[PDB]
Design a protein around this ligand. Structure first.
Ligand SMILES: COc1ccc2nc(C)c(O[C@@H]3C[C@H]4C(=O)N[C@]5(C(=O)NS(=O)(=O)C6(C)CC6)C[C@H]5/C=C\CCCCC[C@H](NC(=O)OC5(C)CCC5)C(=O)N4C3)nc2c1
Ligand SMILES: [Zn+2]
Length: 197
């Protein structure tokens, strides 16, 4: 019992900048600082933007602020705390049945607005700042207009699907593939988040 370890915190290591004319990834912390922040849970870096790049000791993925909650996937974060300036912060939402977790949105982040447009013309934002057109096909499904190898989507779970107006429509959860080519995506609809709150 004395030699039992504690898993580290999720750590913000960068962001996807959607501010201006061009989307681009920014890194805010390197691997050594990430590993240390994961163990202490103390992250004093300023946070900005809507889409964060996050990492554990073993995985990296995305997390998206909607309505004052930083949302991501359970298969990335598990039940882990997130590092913050005052120490590890416990999850405010955990739903393994939805592959969904959330923490209070960090001070300085901006939140996306939940979409009420009812539009089926969506855009998936990846960890490489690709903005991928996706046609909505169901409550939790959308097809890529231009399929591509799943490699290009790996590490983007927790990223947003946006409507034409830039509202949040869902959180990227899984990729549907044939012969390694992603033809469709599975996502947590924003309404499932809004119900969870
Ligand atoms: C443990 O407790 C839980 C609870 C509920 C869970 N619920 C789901 C649906 C789940 O699925 C896992 C993880 C997810 C994934 O891989 N997600 C993306 C991703 O990027 N992760 S990641 O960031 O790299 C990483 C791992 C965090 C660091 C976007 C994926 C990108 C590429 C796919 C790669 C090949 C995989 C193709 C696969 N496909 C698929 O399952 O399709 C369907 C059958 C499911 C409905 C249709 C797929 O996508 N996943 C498999 N695990 C759960 C686990
Ligand atoms: Zn909208």
């Amino acid at each position: 019992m004395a030699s039992m370890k504690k898993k580290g915190s999720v750590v913000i290591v960068g962001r996807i900048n959607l501010s201006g004319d061009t989307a681009y990834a920014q890194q805010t912390r390197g691997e050594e600082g990430c590993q240390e922040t994961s163990q202490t849970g103390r992250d004093k870096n300023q946070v900005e933007g809507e889409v964060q790049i996050v990492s554990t000791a073993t995985q990296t993925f995305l997390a998206t602020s909607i309505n004052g909650v930083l949302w991501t996937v359970y298969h990335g974060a598990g039940t882990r705390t997130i590092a913050s300036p005052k120490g590890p912060v416990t999850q405010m939402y955990t739903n393994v049945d939805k592959d969904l977790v959330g923490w209070q949105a960090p001070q300085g982040s901006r939140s996306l607005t939940p979409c009420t447009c009812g539009s089926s013309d969506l855009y998936l934002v990846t960890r490489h700042a690709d903005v991928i057109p996706v046609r909505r096909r169901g409550d939790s499904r959308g097809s890529l207009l231009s399929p591509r190898p799943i490699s290009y989507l790996k590490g983007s779970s927790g990223g947003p699907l946006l409507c034409p107006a830039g509202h949040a429509v869902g959180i990227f959860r899984a990729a549907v593939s044939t012969r390694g080519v992603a033809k469709a995506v599975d996502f947590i609809p924003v309404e499932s988040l809004e119900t969870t709150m």
